[PDB]
Amino acid sequence: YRDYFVIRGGKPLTGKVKISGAKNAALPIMFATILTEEPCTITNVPDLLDVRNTLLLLRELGAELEFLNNTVFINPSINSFITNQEIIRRMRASVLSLGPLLGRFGRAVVGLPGGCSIGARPIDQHLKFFKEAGADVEVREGYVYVNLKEKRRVHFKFDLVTVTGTENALLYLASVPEESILENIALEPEVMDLIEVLKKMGAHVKVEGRSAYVKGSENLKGFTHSVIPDRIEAGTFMVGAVLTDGEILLENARINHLRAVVEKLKLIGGEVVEENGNLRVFRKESLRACDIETQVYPGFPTDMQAQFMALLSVAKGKSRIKENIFEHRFHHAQELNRLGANITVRGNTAYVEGVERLYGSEVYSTDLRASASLVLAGLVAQGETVVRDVYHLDRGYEKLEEKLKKLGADIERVSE
Numbered sequence: 001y002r003d004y005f006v007i008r009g010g011k012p013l014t015g016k017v018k019i020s021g022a023k024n025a026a027l028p029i030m031f032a033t034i035l036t037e038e039p040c041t042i043t044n045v046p047d048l049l050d051v052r053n054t055l056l057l058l059r060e061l062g063a064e065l066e067f068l069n070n071t072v073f074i075n076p077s078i079n080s081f082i083t084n085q086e087i088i089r090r091m092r093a094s095v096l097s098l099g100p101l102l103g104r105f106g107r108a109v110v111g112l113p114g115g116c117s118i119g120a121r122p123i124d125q126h127l128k129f130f131k132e133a134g135a136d137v138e139v140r141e142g143y144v145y146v147n148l149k150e151k152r153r154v155h156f157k158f159d160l161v162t163v164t165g166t167e168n169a170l171l172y173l174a175s176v177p178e179e180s181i182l183e184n185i186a187l188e189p190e191v192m193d194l195i196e197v198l199k200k201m202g203a204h205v206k207v208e209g210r211s212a213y214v215k216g217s218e219n220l221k222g223f224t225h226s227v228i229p230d231r232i233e234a235g236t237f238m239v240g241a242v243l244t245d246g247e248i249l250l251e252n253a254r255i256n257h258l259r260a261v262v263e264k265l266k267l268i269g270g271e272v273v274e275e276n277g278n279l280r281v282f283r284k285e286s287l288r289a290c291d292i293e294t295q296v297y298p299g300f301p302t303d304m305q306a307q308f309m310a311l312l313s314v315a316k317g318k319s320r321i322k323e324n325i326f327e328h329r330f331h332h333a334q335e336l337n338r339l340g341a342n343i344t345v346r347g348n349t350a351y352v353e354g355v356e357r358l359y360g361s362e363v364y365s366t367d368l369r370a371s372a373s374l375v376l377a378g379l380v381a382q383g384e385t386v387v388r389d390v391y392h393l394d395r396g397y398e399k400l401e402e403k404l405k406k407l408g409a410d411i412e413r414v415s416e
């Protein structure tokens with residue numbers, strides 16, 4: 001659909017906002033249900049497009065489920081191991097179905113992801129792991145055909161840190177009745193949340209440094225779990241508060257999943273005060289430039305890069321923002337320039353020369369997470385900002401415009 005936002009800037013964000021469950025924790029956790037025949041219950045699952053597409057895939061695979069009150073009730077009656085190309089083209093993370101399906105049937109046919117606006121994003125590490133696991137892997141008809149003669153212990157080291165690569169490996173190993181080892185894994189909170197679920201199902205998982213020791217099982221149980229809060233949504237609203245010089249209280253967020261974000265926010269001039277579990281955020285000092293480099297967790301999230309770039313576009317001084325994760329992820333920089341920003345891009349590094357003010361205009365969303373930066377900029381840009389193709393934002397945030405409206409943003413959605 002061609003829905004879009006109309007943001008009339010000039011209002012400070014003030015008030016409470018309830019942070020939703022983590023989209024990227026819910027996804028792998030839902031795919032984990034494929035590992036058992038027993039019923040599972042997953043709560044605090046956000047109602048956003050990626051979750052809905054995942055549920056559609058599970059139903060296509062044979063599962064019986066319901067999604068009500070941010071809770072997924074599923075009977076994992078999987079009777080197929082084919083993840084079609086259409087679903088993969090709609091959400092490349094559907095590749096997470098590979099590990100579970102292989103662990104359940106010893107076979108899987110999953111469409112190979114195509115390019116993405118964020119980058120080529122190949123999955124060589126995923127395929128490399130499964131080959132190291134002893135599976136026969138062949139690409140035909142744009143599908144990855146994986147066949148496993150027999151499950152055996154695995155000792156694999158990732159050539160680079162990959163979030164879903166780590167998750168796909170863990171999902172499979174959880175089904176192998178032997179002791180396996182993964183080295184150089186991702187430590188993102190979502191990966192840790194998936195790990196708790198796999199343990200609840202019966203697998204043993206020990207994390208030391210970036211190594212994961214796994215002892216799987218062929219009789220995994222059903223589980224009940226409440227997914228962690230979404231740290232990217234939380235960070236986004238924090239930026240919103242500082243940028244608009246408002247004062248917000250985030251409810252249901254986790255400060256322990258936001259260290260790098262809070263650190264940079266304070267360097268820029270914002271402040272974050274913890275009240276019990278709540279986080280009160282506001283601007284303490286005038287905005288100032290700061291250098292930022294994205295890194296795998298616990299470092300600064302690439303998923304928060306665009307949002308901070310919007311904040312820095314109106315800060316005093318020149319900021320350097322380098323991407324070490326998705327080096328191509330800068331489409332938003334030029335959209336911000338359309339609002340009067342002064343951002344330059346040279347390779348994997350962007351330089352932001354702060355300007356006194358932004359001027360509202362039409363900008364296009366293209367990144368389910370990074371495009372939130374456009375909404376943020378629209379909150380302070382002079383006049384009105386039109387954010388096109390919010391379909392992307394609907395994939396990455398639950399009721400974004402509604403939460404902003406509740407905080408005083410003069411935003412509205414035009415269904416088209």
Ligand SMILES: C=C(O[C@H]1[C@H](O)[C@@H](CO)O[C@H](OP(=O)(O)OP(=O)(O)OC[C@H]2O[C@@H](n3ccc(=O)[nH]c3=O)[C@H](O)[C@@H]2O)[C@@H]1NC(C)=O)C(=O)O
Nearest residue numbers: 024093121122123124125126161162163164165303325326
């Ligand atoms: C973009 C999203 O969030 C993303 C988030 O930005 C990134 C980085 O933190 O980690 C997840 O993707 P991801 O697992 O594909 O990211 P990674 O695998 O760690 O890729 C990091 C870098 O490694 C490279 N990479 C990764 C795997 C691989 O086999 N080969 C490879 O070259 C990628 O090209 C990328 O430049 C999140 N997605 C989910 C479903 O967990 C989203 O919500 O869709």
